[PDB]
Amino acid sequence: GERPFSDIITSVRYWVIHSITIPALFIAGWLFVSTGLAYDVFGTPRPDSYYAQEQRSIPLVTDRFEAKQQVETFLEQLK
Amino acid sequence: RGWFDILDDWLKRDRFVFVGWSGILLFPCAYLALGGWLTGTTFVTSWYTHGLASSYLEGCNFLTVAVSTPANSMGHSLLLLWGPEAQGDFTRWCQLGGLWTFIALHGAFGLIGFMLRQFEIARLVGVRPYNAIAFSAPIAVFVSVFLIYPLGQSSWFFAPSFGVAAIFRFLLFFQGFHNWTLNPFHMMGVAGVLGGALLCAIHGATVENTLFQDGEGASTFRAFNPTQAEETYSMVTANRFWSQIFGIAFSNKRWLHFFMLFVPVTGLWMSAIGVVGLALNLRSYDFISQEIRAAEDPEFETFYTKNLLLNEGIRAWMAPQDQPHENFVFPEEVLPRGNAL
Amino acid sequence: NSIFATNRDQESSGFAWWAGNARLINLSGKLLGAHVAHAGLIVFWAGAMTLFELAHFIPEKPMYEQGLILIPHIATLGWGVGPGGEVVDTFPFFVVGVVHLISSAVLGFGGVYHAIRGPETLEEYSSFFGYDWKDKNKMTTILGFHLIVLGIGALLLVAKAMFFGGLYDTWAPGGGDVRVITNPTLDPRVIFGYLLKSPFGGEGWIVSVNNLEDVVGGHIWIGLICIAGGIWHILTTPFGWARRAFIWSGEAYLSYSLGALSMMGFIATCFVWFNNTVYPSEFYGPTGPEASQAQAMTFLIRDQKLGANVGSAQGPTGLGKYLMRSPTGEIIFGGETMRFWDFRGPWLEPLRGPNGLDLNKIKNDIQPWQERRAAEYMTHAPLGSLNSVGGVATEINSVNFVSPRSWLATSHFVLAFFFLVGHLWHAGRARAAAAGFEKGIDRESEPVLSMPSLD
Amino acid sequence: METLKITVYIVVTFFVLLFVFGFLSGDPARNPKRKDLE
Amino acid sequence: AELTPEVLTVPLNSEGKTITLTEKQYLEGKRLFQYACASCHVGGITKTNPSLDLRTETLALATPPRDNIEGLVDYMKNPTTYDGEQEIAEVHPSLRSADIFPKMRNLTEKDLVAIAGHILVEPKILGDKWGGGKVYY
Amino acid sequence: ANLWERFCNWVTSTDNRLYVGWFGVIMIPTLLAATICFVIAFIAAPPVDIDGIREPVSGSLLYGNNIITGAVVPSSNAIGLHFYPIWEAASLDEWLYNGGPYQLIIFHFLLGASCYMGRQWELSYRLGMRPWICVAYSAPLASAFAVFLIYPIGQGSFSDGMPLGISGTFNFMIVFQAEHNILMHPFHQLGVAGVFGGALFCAMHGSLVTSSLIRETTETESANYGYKFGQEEETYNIVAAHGYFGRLIFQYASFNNSRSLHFFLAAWPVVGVWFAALGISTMAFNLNGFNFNHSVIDAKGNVINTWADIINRANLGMEVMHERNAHNFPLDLA
Numbered sequence A: 001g002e003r004p005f006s007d008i009i010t011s012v013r014y015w016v017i018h019s020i021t022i023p024a025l026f027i028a029g030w031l032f033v034s035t036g037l038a039y040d041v042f043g044t045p046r047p048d049s050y051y052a053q054e055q056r057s058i059p060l061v062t063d064r065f066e067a068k069q070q071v072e073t074f075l076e077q078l079k
Numbered sequence B: 001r002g003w004f005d006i007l008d009d010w011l012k013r014d015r016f017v018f019v020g021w022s023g024i025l026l027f028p029c030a031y032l033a034l035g036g037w038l039t040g041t042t043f044v045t046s047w048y049t050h051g052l053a054s055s056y057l058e059g060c061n062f063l064t065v066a067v068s069t070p071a072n073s074m075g076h077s078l079l080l081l082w083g084p085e086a087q088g089d090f091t092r093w094c095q096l097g098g099l100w101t102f103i104a105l106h107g108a109f110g111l112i113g114f115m116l117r118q119f120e121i122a123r124l125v126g127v128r129p130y131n132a133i134a135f136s137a138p139i140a141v142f143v144s145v146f147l148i149y150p151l152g153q154s155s156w157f158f159a160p161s162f163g164v165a166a167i168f169r170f171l172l173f174f175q176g177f178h179n180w181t182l183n184p185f186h187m188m189g190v191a192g193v194l195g196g197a198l199l200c201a202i203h204g205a206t207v208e209n210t211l212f213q214d215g216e217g218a219s220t221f222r223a224f225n226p227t228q229a230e231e232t233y234s235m236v237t238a239n240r241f242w243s244q245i246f247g248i249a250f251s252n253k254r255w256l257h258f259f260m261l262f263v264p265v266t267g268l269w270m271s272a273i274g275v276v277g278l279a280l281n282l283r284s285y286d287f288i289s290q291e292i293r294a295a296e297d298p299e300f301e302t303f304y305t306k307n308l309l310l311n312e313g314i315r316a317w318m319a320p321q322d323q324p325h326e327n328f329v330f331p332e333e334v335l336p337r338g339n340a341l
Numbered sequence C: 001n002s003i004f005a006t007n008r009d010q011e012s013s014g015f016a017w018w019a020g021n022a023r024l025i026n027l028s029g030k031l032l033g034a035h036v037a038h039a040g041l042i043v044f045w046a047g048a049m050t051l052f053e054l055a056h057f058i059p060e061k062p063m064y065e066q067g068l069i070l071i072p073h074i075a076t077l078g079w080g081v082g083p084g085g086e087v088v089d090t091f092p093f094f095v096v097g098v099v100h101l102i103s104s105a106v107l108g109f110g111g112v113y114h115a116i117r118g119p120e121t122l123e124e125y126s127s128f129f130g131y132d133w134k135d136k137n138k139m140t141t142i143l144g145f146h147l148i149v150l151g152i153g154a155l156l157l158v159a160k161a162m163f164f165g166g167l168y169d170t171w172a173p174g175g176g177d178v179r180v181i182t183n184p185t186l187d188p189r190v191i192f193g194y195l196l197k198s199p200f201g202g203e204g205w206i207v208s209v210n211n212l213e214d215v216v217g218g219h220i221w222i223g224l225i226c227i228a229g230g231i232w233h234i235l236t237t238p239f240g241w242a243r244r245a246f247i248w249s250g251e252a253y254l255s256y257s258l259g260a261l262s263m264m265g266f267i268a269t270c271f272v273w274f275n276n277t278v279y280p281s282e283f284y285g286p287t288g289p290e291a292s293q294a295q296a297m298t299f300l301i302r303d304q305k306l307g308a309n310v311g312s313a314q315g316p317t318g319l320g321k322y323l324m325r326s327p328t329g330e331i332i333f334g335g336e337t338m339r340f341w342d343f344r345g346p347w348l349e350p351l352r353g354p355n356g357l358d359l360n361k362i363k364n365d366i367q368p369w370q371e372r373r374a375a376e377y378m379t380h381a382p383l384g385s386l387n388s389v390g391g392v393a394t395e396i397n398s399v400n401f402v403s404p405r406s407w408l409a410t411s412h413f414v415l416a417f418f419f420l421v422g423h424l425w426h427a428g429r430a431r432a433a434a435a436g437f438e439k440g441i442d443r444e445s446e447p448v449l450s451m452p453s454l455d
Numbered sequence D: 001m002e003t004l005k006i007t008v009y010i011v012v013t014f015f016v017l018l019f020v021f022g023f024l025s026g027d028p029a030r031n032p033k034r035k036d037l038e
Numbered sequence E: 001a002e003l004t005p006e007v008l009t010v011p012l013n014s015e016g017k018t019i020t021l022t023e024k025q026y027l028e029g030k031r032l033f034q035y036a037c038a039s040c041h042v043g044g045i046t047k048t049n050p051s052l053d054l055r056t057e058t059l060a061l062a063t064p065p066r067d068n069i070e071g072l073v074d075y076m077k078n079p080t081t082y083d084g085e086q087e088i089a090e091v092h093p094s095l096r097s098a099d100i101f102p103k104m105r106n107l108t109e110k111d112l113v114a115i116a117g118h119i120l121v122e123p124k125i126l127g128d129k130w131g132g133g134k135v136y137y
Numbered sequence F: 001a002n003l004w005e006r007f008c009n010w011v012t013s014t015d016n017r018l019y020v021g022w023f024g025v026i027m028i029p030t031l032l033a034a035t036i037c038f039v040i041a042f043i044a045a046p047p048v049d050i051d052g053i054r055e056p057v058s059g060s061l062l063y064g065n066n067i068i069t070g071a072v073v074p075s076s077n078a079i080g081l082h083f084y085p086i087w088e089a090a091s092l093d094e095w096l097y098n099g100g101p102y103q104l105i106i107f108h109f110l111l112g113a114s115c116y117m118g119r120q121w122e123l124s125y126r127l128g129m130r131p132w133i134c135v136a137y138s139a140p141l142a143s144a145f146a147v148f149l150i151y152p153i154g155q156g157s158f159s160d161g162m163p164l165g166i167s168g169t170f171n172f173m174i175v176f177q178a179e180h181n182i183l184m185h186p187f188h189q190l191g192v193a194g195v196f197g198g199a200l201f202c203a204m205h206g207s208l209v210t211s212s213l214i215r216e217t218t219e220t221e222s223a224n225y226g227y228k229f230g231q232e233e234e235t236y237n238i239v240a241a242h243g244y245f246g247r248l249i250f251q252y253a254s255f256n257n258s259r260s261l262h263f264f265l266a267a268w269p270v271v272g273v274w275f276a277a278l279g280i281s282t283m284a285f286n287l288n289g290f291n292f293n294h295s296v297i298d299a300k301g302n303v304i305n306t307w308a309d310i311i312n313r314a315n316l317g318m319e320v321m322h323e324r325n326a327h328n329f330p331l332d333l334a
């Protein structure tokens, strides 16, 4: 009932459509990182944000219900 | 001709991707489970829960990325996005490990959905539902290792993390703390898995080498038709070969294929039972008789006592970095070590 | 006009595309092209790889620190290196690479020509170059020509060793040097005595050859046996016992050679792993046994300088901490390296006496170059990760090193194994095709149905 | 020990000769189809 | 945490003057250390004599002191035992022994300064990991 | 009609209850020798000084082992790769102290198992079968060669061969992980894929055929009785099984050529175990698993641990404790 893929991906209309959409997604994912937006969405430390300058303690969550406030505290300690 | 029967009509249409009523559960939960793993291994850290980098973004590779378990302090929290810990904050949720319970719970319901799909398709096509029955074993493994085991321990932290090297760590933790290779239930599982691999290889090789010459080409794959009535290989010649090489052989084609179902499914089920015990630290750790003799006789040594020394090394050397919430400080002088090393 | 117009399809040949090169079994002209073009690839790789190695070569690093496997082969033959394996001239490396690379164009040309332009079969064009696999005289004749080429190749090694500069001798007085071989060993009791030697520890079969005179003289015998055998095979035809023993077909001949090459690859794997004469440790790095002995030596030296009497220091188990006895009494290094006492090397043999290691020589005669050499080899042991992190599995990143010996041993064990699989596959197929049942059991004449029951 | 050694050497040689002369004794012909393979 | 100029400021001599290396000088030193020294000194230890490490405290108590750039550069030129009592260029790489340790040949004085600064900066970053051995991996 | 021809006909007879054949002429005595020695040694052998340090390990049942802890202990590290037959010992007591039985057992076993593989080719020729069942068996056989022969060769001693016992096997696996990081080696990972995949495909094939059996029995009897040995017709509906499996995934992930299916079943586990055996055989020459220890560092240069560094901690605990009295110098180079 559905049209074979081999005719779709050898057709001109497919390549016209997808020579646009495929680079647009690939470029958008690239900028998601290079603008640094990825770090702030997910909360991942940038290479200079694992430790404060002189400490070697890990900022480990130790409380169940105050965990949100503990992480915020540790982010503040990056001055 | 109510809406229910119309909706049933549409769900069960013969399309490229069968949907079924089962699909309503299977497809979202499986998609979210896989999508969460890919999202987490690409972008999300394990720094606040484990003291670890675990994403492509941090510099990990395919072998070392993981979605890691939540912090020990979370207990066995469901860790809902809207729960009291993350409080709606998607970013905190990721940093607190919420993607772990997200993948675990959506994966579990996804697995239920795949099994229901097996029943649903079997019922429409008109076959016995043994494929679904065989699939109970993967579910038993997943439920016992990823859910039951941490529920018996202090928290989700000690469950497996979803990653390649993270699972390797889980293997080694189980040797050192649980002496899991000594567990008769693991041994039965090993036999089921290896015996299944053996059966798969021997049956496939036997068929491919007792084929009937139903064509003239040197490639024998073309001399088979899906609607032929005759068997494509000789059971009689296969039985004589194995009877004379090995002493015994299959003679019943139905028993042979039931046995190919039975061996690995039973093995996985046996291993699930041992892991339930380990949820309680109900280990096969020691042989008491060996310990009494070794305590009293410093010349008695076996491969059993030798392996305990290695477990003791595993525990002391991995615990501080592996359980950072414990704040183990083991001065060098207390670390067990042999001579020189 | 038609996609199926040629004989290069399943319909014409019976073979699917994934066995496509089996379509060549009876097309001697295209088959000749396949072989000659493949010989070009081999020659191409030898040439391009050498130029890569030379382009990446820093001469004041040891070769084995730089990932080289071809330049060490050239250096071993006496080109580009002086006393102690120092590199004095990189130009001979350049030449080997260039000449191989240029010649690969000649071979690729003839290969492509014979594969896609020239006569597809040869038997009408020439009774000489044409052949029928079932023609045992023609087959032994081609085998005879190739034996002769191989013997000439063995003798080229002799000529380089005896008349064109010599070979690098790791054992030569003064830390090793290029040396001309003027008295190659010819006594068959020495040469064929290697062949009858046990392959287990302390004996080592032919991997134990430890001087260049035996190596050179070994190739004098091989070259003569080969030219005599090629002549025998051009002038004779197989006897009846041989005729009744073998399967005479193209696939069968292939399977015999696969078995032969499998065995040779297993032998090369041990050669490079154990032997430090024709694989000098200066070029390839220390062997496993060597690096292990060198650690014992390193710490015997350090502790004796601090005042330890190493000969009488009792270790924790009761065995000597530095020195102990082997099961036949020889004084040997202590610790786990007790397993490696069969090791011999130029940097260690001066301390050796009739009873093994000499405590007097250990106390007085250890030179600084031995200390230097044992420290270098202990820190370049053949251990490393797949991503080339040197050291034991638990080491941290820093040192980018995997020994050439590990690269050469592992690659050639892997190849030797798959080539034994290939031997079993083609050998079994050749037998089944000759007897007529390689495509399956004929339904109307199933042999098992005419056999009595077992019970 | 020297008697044991001779015994094993003789036994091993016996069985290897059987293997070699067995496969030299027209083995390709010992199949259920084409029995003429020289 | 960043690699800051304070981190990169190390003792120039025993008198107490200090030099400040550049980020690229440190990274060049790390590379030359790997090239020339790491085979024995990976992570700050000494595989052929584990009693001597490259910890700053150990270097401080060497004779003469080696916990500064000039002491380390001099060591790399004319190495001695820990008590100053004996010259060991014949068994330890040095410019003085670059004929038997050929990897030292292409090294210049500025290269030695790079290696030295790396040896002195790395324990400021790693702590006990430097010179600590497998216990701290 | 002469004696040798009548013997050749008996040896290669397709009428013997168990086929002998020319490979069986070598196989039968060597497997008997290996079997009898193994049974006697597992029950009654005195302790063996495995690591060459006069510290004998007890392997046998009479000397305080059970089924799980018992082993035939590898031969002494003082022997290395030397050949140690009975007649090279001054006495049986010497031979037992130093682990002689282990060598006799594995050498005879490897010989006998190689002939077992040849015997699989040979009988298939006498029966008119296609020849490649022995090829599938080369995957477990090459695995035995790896742990009993190749790995000792690369490490310099049969004392690092795999012990012949259950708990001894575990000691082999733990020490191997400490010294080679086998879990991080792609060839062991391919091997896991083979055996995990083989067990999956085993159950898959078993469950599909079983669930498309054609009704030939009542509900009070075993469905197995619906198949008769030697019947010409196939006993299950492969089109029905394909219709199920195709709809389960998509139509084109489901075989309908039975010969493609069974070749796939043979191929997946055999290829994976080939790589498992090649992992062991190449880690015998110390080309080890991937080393990502301290691969990730931050802007200052702090080490940021990954899961790879946690594995390394466990490896260290194994490394420092194994053979606790056998190392005098800081690096365990073999």
Ligand code: CLA
Pocket (backbone or CB within 6 Å): B024, B025, B028, B029, B032, B078, B079, B080, B081, B082, B098, B101, B102, B105, B106, B109
């Ligand atoms: C469709 C299948 C499906 C299933 C089974 C699940 C299941 C789950 N999701 Mg997932 N999810 C899905 C699709 C699904 N999800 C989709 C499509 C998205 C994208 C939007 C998500 C995005 C998502 C996020 C972001 C999160 C989850 C979470 C969860 C978990 C908690 C759910 C919960 O507590 O809700 C409870 C809600 C219900 C049970 C609703 C039913 C209410 C019924 C209809 C009321 C009946 C009343 C009766 C009829 C009449 C009473 C009237 C009376 C007044 C008289 C659970 C494992 C959480 C999680 O995983 O934490 C780790 C979480 O944070 N999901």
Ligand code: CLA
Pocket (backbone or CB within 6 Å): C007, C008, C009, C016, C017, C018, C019, C020, C021, C022, C023, C024, C027, C030, C031, C033, C034, C035, C037, C038, C105, C108, C109, C110, C112, C115, C116
């Ligand atoms: C070393 C690798 C190698 C070599 C030397 C060959 C050689 C050959 N193959 Mg085989 N084959 C191979 C690998 C190889 N194959 C692999 C990996 C597969 C699986 C994909 C096959 C599957 C296969 C099938 C199914 C068939 C062959 C056939 C052939 C023969 C005829 C090819 C032909 O007419 O093409 C014509 C091709 C062209 C006209 C296109 C261009 C080809 C040229 C040679 C490219 C060379 C480029 C090179 C840079 C030029 C250098 C010039 C320089 C020296 C100046 C030929 C002797 C055929 C045969 O048996 O005929 C009876 C056949 O049907 N092969």
Ligand code: CLA
Pocket (backbone or CB within 6 Å): C045, C052, C053, C056, C066, C067, C068, C069, C386, C388, C404, C407, C408, C411, C414, C418
């Ligand atoms: C004899 C074979 C051989 C050996 C022992 C070596 C050894 C080496 N090479 Mg060389 N090389 C070779 C062939 C070989 N090479 C070939 C054929 C090429 C052309 C591609 C090269 C081109 C090359 C370059 C450009 C470079 C090297 C380099 C090196 C060094 C580092 C290797 C490394 O990091 O690999 C990493 C390991 C792998 C990639 C292994 C991956 C796993 C393989 C692919 C599995 C193979 C499976 C099997 C063959 C197939 C089975 C199929 C099954 C279905 C039956 C090392 C000394 C480097 C060097 O240091 O130069 C000085 C370097 O820069 N090599």
Ligand code: CLA
Pocket (backbone or CB within 6 Å): C032, C036, C106, C107, C109, C110, C111, C113, C114, C118, C119, C122, C125, C126, C129
């Ligand atoms: C070794 C493999 C090999 C074999 C068996 C053949 C055989 C043949 N070739 Mg082919 N060919 C080859 C390689 C080979 N060639 C190579 C390498 C090239 C590229 C140069 C060619 C290019 C080629 C062309 C263009 C033609 C042939 C032709 C022929 C046919 C007649 C040749 C003749 O009688 O010359 C007579 C003999 C000589 C001239 C002796 C020359 C000896 C050379 C120059 C030196 C030998 C020394 C030493 C052995 C070489 C070592 C090289 C090695 C180290 C790499 C004959 C079937 C002809 C044909 O197809 O007829 C229809 C034809 O036109 N060949």
Ligand code: CLA
Pocket (backbone or CB within 6 Å): C140, C143, C147, C195, C196, C225, C226, C228, C229, C230, C232, C233, C236, C237, C238, C239, C242, D020
């Ligand atoms: C590539 C090299 C090669 C190949 C493929 C052949 C192939 C052949 N030769 Mg030729 N031969 C060669 C080189 C070669 N030869 C050389 C260099 C010489 C000079 C010495 C000879 C001298 C020669 C003679 C005098 C005869 C042959 C014969 C034959 C045919 C019978 C083969 C046979 O029965 O072997 C199988 C080997 C045996 C049956 C003997 C027993 C082998 C023992 C059991 C193996 C022990 C090896 C051991 C495991 C490992 C090696 C170490 C060991 C030395 C200690 C066959 C076509 C025969 C023939 O028909 O001539 C026309 C024949 O009478 N050859």
Ligand SMILES: CC(C)=CCC/C(C)=C/CC/C(C)=C/CC/C(C)=C/CC/C(C)=C/CC/C(C)=C/CC/C(C)=C/CC/C(C)=C/CC/C(C)=C/CC1=CC(=O)C(C)=C(C)C1=O
Pocket (backbone or CB within 6 Å): B187, B188, B189, B191, B192, B195, B196, B198, B199, B202, B203, B204, B206, B207, B235, B238, B239, B242, B246, B248, B249, B250, B251, B256, B262, B263, B266, B267, B270, F039, F042, F043, F067, F165, F166
């Ligand atoms: C002196 C003393 C005491 C010595 C003791 C030494 C010692 C250490 C003993 C160890 C004790 C020991 C055995 C421990 C093992 C214990 C262990 C772990 C047991 C597991 C038991 C258990 C319940 C496991 C649960 C999982 C399970 C059911 C596993 C079963 C595994 C199994 C039997 C797999 C089958 C493997 C096998 C060889 C199959 C052969 C089948 C065969 C003949 C195929 C031939 C064939 C193929 C075809 O394709 C066709 C067409 C035909 C026609 C045909 O025929």
Ligand code: HEC
Pocket (backbone or CB within 6 Å): C375, C376, C379, E033, E036, E037, E038, E039, E040, E041, E046, E048, E049, E052, E053, E054, E055, E058, E059, E062, E066, E072, E075, E076, E080, E081, E082, E088, E092, E093, E115
């Ligand atoms: C093995 C062949 C080595 C190489 C390569 C390098 N070093 Fe070394 N180092 C080695 C030893 C055996 C010793 C102690 C020698 C003794 O008897 O005292 C050393 C010592 C040093 C020291 C002294 C450390 C101390 O605490 O006093 C320094 C500062 C040092 N080495 C530096 C150094 C550098 C910079 C290297 C690369 C150019 C280097 N070493 C290489 C062994 C080896």
Ligand SMILES: CC1=C(/C=C/C(C)=C/C=C/C(C)=C/C=C/C=C(C)/C=C/C=C(C)/C=C/C2=C(C)CCCC2(C)C)C(C)(C)CCC1
Pocket (backbone or CB within 6 Å): B031, B032, B034, B035, B036, B038, B039
């Ligand atoms: C989480 C979450 C979510 C979701 C999300 C999603 C859904 C996602 C998805 C995602 C995705 C979906 C992604 C994907 C990715 C992919 C990738 C990243 C891939 C890669 C690949 C590759 C790299 C490949 C490779 C290869 C192989 C594997 C083999 C063959 C060959 C080759 C080489 C090609 C939501 C919102 C709901 C909620 C919140 C949370």
Ligand SMILES: CC1=C(/C=C/C(C)=C/C=C/C(C)=C/C=C/C=C(C)/C=C/C=C(C)/C=C/C2=C(C)CCCC2(C)C)C(C)(C)CCC1
Pocket (backbone or CB within 6 Å): C033, C034, C037, C038, C040, C041, C044, C098, C101, C102, C104, C105, C107, C108, C109, C111, C112, C115
């Ligand atoms: C048949 C066939 C095939 C194959 C083919 C082949 C295999 C071929 C080969 C070929 C070859 C084998 C080629 C070669 C070539 C070479 C060349 C062409 C070279 C050149 C060189 C040069 C140019 C050089 C240069 C230089 C110098 C001199 C100096 C230094 C630098 C340089 C480098 C620059 C195939 C499979 C595809 C398919 C189809 C069929």
Ligand SMILES: CC1=C(/C=C/C(C)=C/C=C/C(C)=C/C=C/C=C(C)/C=C/C=C(C)/C=C/C2=C(C)CCCC2(C)C)C(C)(C)CCC1
Pocket (backbone or CB within 6 Å): C190, C191, C192, C194, C195, C206, C209, C214, C215, C216, C218, C219, C221, C222, C245, D019, D020, D021, D023, D024
């Ligand atoms: C160079 C050199 C040398 C020398 C060498 C030599 C001298 C060698 C030789 C070698 C040889 C001299 C070899 C031989 C071999 C042989 C073989 C390899 C055989 C085989 C066989 C077979 C394979 C057979 C089989 C069979 C049987 C048994 C039965 C019947 C059937 C058949 C035929 C199959 C030396 C070391 C001094 C030093 C270094 C260098």
Ligand code: OEX
Pocket (backbone or CB within 6 Å): C336, F051, F077, F155, F159, F160, F175, F179, F322, F323, F326, F332, F333, F334
């Ligand atoms: O012996 Mn069994 O284990 Ca192969 O490393 Mn070295 O040696 Mn012993 O130590 Mn670790």
Ligand SMILES: [Ca+2]
Pocket (backbone or CB within 6 Å): C004, C005, C006, C007, C008, C009, C011, C012
């Ligand atoms: Ca055609």
Ligand SMILES: [Cl-]
Pocket (backbone or CB within 6 Å): C334, C335, C336, C337, F326, F327, F328, F329
């Ligand atoms: Cl040691």
